[PDB]
Design an enzyme around this catalytic site. Structure first.
Site, mmCIF file in Angstrom:
data_model
loop_
_atom_site.group_PDB
_atom_site.id
_atom_site.type_symbol
_atom_site.label_atom_id
_atom_site.label_comp_id
_atom_site.label_asym_id
_atom_site.label_seq_id
_atom_site.Cartn_x
_atom_site.Cartn_y
_atom_site.Cartn_z
ATOM 1 N N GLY A 7 0.821 -1.196 0.000
ATOM 2 C CA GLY A 7 0.000 0.000 0.000
ATOM 3 C C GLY A 7 0.857 1.249 0.000
ATOM 4 N N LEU A 8 0.222 2.406 -0.153
ATOM 5 C CA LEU A 8 0.936 3.673 -0.058
ATOM 6 C C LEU A 8 0.293 4.586 0.967
ATOM 7 C CD1 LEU A 8 2.094 4.744 -3.588
ATOM 8 C CD2 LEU A 8 3.078 3.134 -1.946
ATOM 9 N N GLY A 9 1.095 5.011 1.937
ATOM 10 C CA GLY A 9 0.574 5.776 3.051
ATOM 11 C C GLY A 9 0.883 7.253 2.955
ATOM 12 N N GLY B 287 4.925 7.526 3.484
ATOM 13 C CA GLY B 287 5.764 6.411 3.098
ATOM 14 C C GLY B 287 5.069 5.269 2.382
ATOM 15 N N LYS C 184 5.823 -0.450 8.073
ATOM 16 C CA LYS C 184 5.785 0.944 7.653
ATOM 17 C C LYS C 184 7.104 1.612 8.031
ATOM 18 C CE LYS C 184 2.124 4.419 7.280
ATOM 19 N NZ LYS C 184 1.054 5.144 8.008
ATOM 20 N N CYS D 54 -0.651 -8.290 9.393
ATOM 21 C CA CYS D 54 -0.886 -8.310 7.955
ATOM 22 C C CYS D 54 -2.380 -8.442 7.656
ATOM 23 C CB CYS D 54 -0.116 -9.474 7.327
ATOM 24 S SG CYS D 54 0.193 -9.281 5.566
ATOM 25 N N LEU D 55 -2.861 -7.688 6.670
ATOM 26 C CA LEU D 55 -4.293 -7.656 6.361
ATOM 27 C C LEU D 55 -4.568 -8.059 4.911
ATOM 28 C CD1 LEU D 55 -5.355 -4.305 8.118
ATOM 29 C CD2 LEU D 55 -5.210 -6.578 9.075
ATOM 30 N N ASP E 208 -8.395 10.718 8.842
ATOM 31 C CA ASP E 208 -8.122 10.203 7.506
ATOM 32 C C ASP E 208 -8.925 8.924 7.233
ATOM 33 O OD1 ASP E 208 -5.195 9.229 5.556
ATOM 34 O OD2 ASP E 208 -6.836 10.604 5.037
HETATM 35 C C1 LIG Z 1 -4.285 -2.628 -2.190
HETATM 36 O O1 LIG Z 1 -4.772 -3.152 -0.936
HETATM 37 C C2 LIG Z 1 -5.303 -4.490 -1.037
HETATM 38 C C3 LIG Z 1 -4.875 -5.301 0.209
HETATM 39 O O2 LIG Z 1 -3.503 -5.725 0.065
HETATM 40 C C4 LIG Z 1 -2.705 -6.130 1.153
HETATM 41 C C5 LIG Z 1 -2.064 -7.393 1.233
HETATM 42 N N1 LIG Z 1 -1.308 -7.702 2.331
HETATM 43 C C6 LIG Z 1 -1.124 -6.848 3.384
HETATM 44 C C7 LIG Z 1 -1.735 -5.573 3.367
HETATM 45 C C8 LIG Z 1 -1.574 -4.596 4.481
HETATM 46 C C9 LIG Z 1 -1.622 -3.202 4.251
HETATM 47 C C10 LIG Z 1 -1.455 -2.316 5.339
HETATM 48 C C11 LIG Z 1 -1.238 -2.824 6.668
HETATM 49 C C12 LIG Z 1 -1.059 -1.937 7.769
HETATM 50 C C13 LIG Z 1 -1.089 -0.530 7.572
HETATM 51 C C14 LIG Z 1 -1.304 -0.045 6.262
HETATM 52 C C15 LIG Z 1 -1.403 1.318 5.609
HETATM 53 C C16 LIG Z 1 -1.646 1.096 4.300
HETATM 54 N N2 LIG Z 1 -1.692 -0.186 4.056
HETATM 55 C C17 LIG Z 1 -1.491 -0.912 5.175
HETATM 56 C C18 LIG Z 1 -1.827 2.206 3.285
HETATM 57 C C19 LIG Z 1 -2.137 3.577 3.976
HETATM 58 N N3 LIG Z 1 -1.625 3.740 5.356
HETATM 59 C C20 LIG Z 1 -1.276 2.693 6.157
HETATM 60 O O3 LIG Z 1 -0.865 2.876 7.288
HETATM 61 C C21 LIG Z 1 -1.207 -4.229 6.836
HETATM 62 N N4 LIG Z 1 -1.373 -5.052 5.755
HETATM 63 C C22 LIG Z 1 -2.519 -5.246 2.237
#
Ligand SMILES: COCCOc1cncc(-c2cc3c(ccc4c5c([nH]c43)CCNC5=O)cn2)c1
Ligand SMILES: [Mg+2]
EC number: 2.7.11.1
Length: 290
Positions: free
Chosen positions: A25-27, A30, A47, A94-95, A140
């Site tokens: 992802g993009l935060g 960062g 992150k 992880c999500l 946000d």
């Molecule tokens: C394109 O998304 C589809 C799902 O894809 C996946 C696959 N595997 C793991 C993740 C994921 C993203 C996270 C996160 C914990 C924090 C964060 C944050 C972001 N994204 C995330 C982006 C914005 N800010 C964050 O802190 C924990 N896990 C996501």
């Protein structure tokens, strides 16, 4: 009630994790990467924030929130030099499930019901309630920041990204734009498009027109529309609070809400060409709300 404070690790994170190169992802400040624990081989998200007073406050506020069942969990935080910059490295659960609306849009039968919108809204609202009761505003809350823990239908929804969160002690209206975000997310959950005034696509809301168009909104109750008008109220002095929200029978008894069939999943497919534009309009709006 007493919770312990954040102990930041100083050793090299790579002594503990294999750190890959794949973006998750993009935060705000960062990029999020895929990593694995070495001793358990388990998968995690990382992150990287450049160390500074701002990142420090993001990590702290996020830590206070970490144990909320519907906020992404922080596993550890490292302080390292990482490519010649001094960084806070944040290891999170992880999500895999993906982004909220992406999962709804990918439903093969396209049958999303009012009752499901309700349960989802209840989960998000619990995250906001946890935060507001200890005087933090997230600020946000939007689609890219709502992700599912796994792909299972039973997966839990989690709120991410504290790059805009702040302490509200004194300035209580900082909480209002979180409530507006709920109004917007709920509205999209119910029809498949935002309550925004904006190709070969349908125009869903005409500029200046009544905000619940009949094609998609005709079978939705006046009660649910009133809930939304309260969340989207223009004056922050009059907008619904998180306490009023969580006490509304529609959220409180989401278990017994009508399983009214919605257009949401269908419209998300038809209009997916403009999803990035929706997210952008909400990002711009949010910048002026907070
Ligand atoms: C394109 O998304 C589809 C799902 O894809 C996946 C696959 N595997 C793991 C993740 C994921 C993203 C996270 C996160 C914990 C924090 C964060 C944050 C972001 N994204 C995330 C982006 C914005 N800010 C964050 O802190 C924990 N896990 C996501
Ligand atoms: Mg949590």
């Amino acid at each position: 009630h007493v919770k312990s404070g954040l102990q930041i690790k100083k050793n090299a994170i790579i002594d503990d994790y294999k750190v890959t190169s794949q973006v998750l992802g993009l935060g705000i400040n960062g990029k999020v990467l895929q990593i694995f624990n070495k001793r358990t081989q388990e998968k995690f998200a990382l992150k990287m924030l450049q160390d500074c007073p701002k990142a420090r406050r993001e990590v702290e506020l996020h830590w206070r929130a970490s144990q909320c069942p519907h906020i992404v969990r922080i596993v550890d935080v490292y302080e390292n030099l990482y490519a010649g910059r001094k960084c806070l490295l944040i290891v999170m659960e992880c999500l895999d499930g993906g982004e909220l609306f992406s999962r709804i849009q990918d439903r093969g039968d396209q049958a999303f019901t009012e009752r499901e919108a309700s349960e989802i809204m209840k989960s998000i609202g619990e995250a906001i309630q946890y935060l507001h009761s200890i005087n933090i505003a997230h600020r946000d809350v939007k689609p890219e920041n709502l992700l599912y823990t796994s792909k299972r239908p039973n997966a839990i929804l989690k709120l991410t990204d504290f790059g805009f969160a702040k302490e509200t002690t004194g300035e209580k209206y900082d909480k209002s734009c979180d409530m507006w975000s709920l109004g917007v997310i709920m509205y999209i959950l119910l029809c498949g498009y935002p309550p925004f005034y904006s190709p070969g696509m349908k125009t869903r809301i005409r500029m200046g027109q009544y905000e619940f168009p009949n094609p998609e909104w005709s079978e939705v109750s006046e009660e649910v529309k009133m809930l939304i008008r309260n969340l989207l109220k223009t004056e922050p002095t009059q907008r619904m609070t998180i306490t009023e929200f969580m006490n509304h029978p529609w959220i409180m008894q989401s278990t017994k809400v009508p399983q009214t069939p919605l257009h949401t999943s269908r419209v998300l497919k038809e209009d997916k060409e403009r999803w990035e534009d929706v997210k952008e309009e909400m990002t711009s709006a949010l910048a002026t709300m907070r």
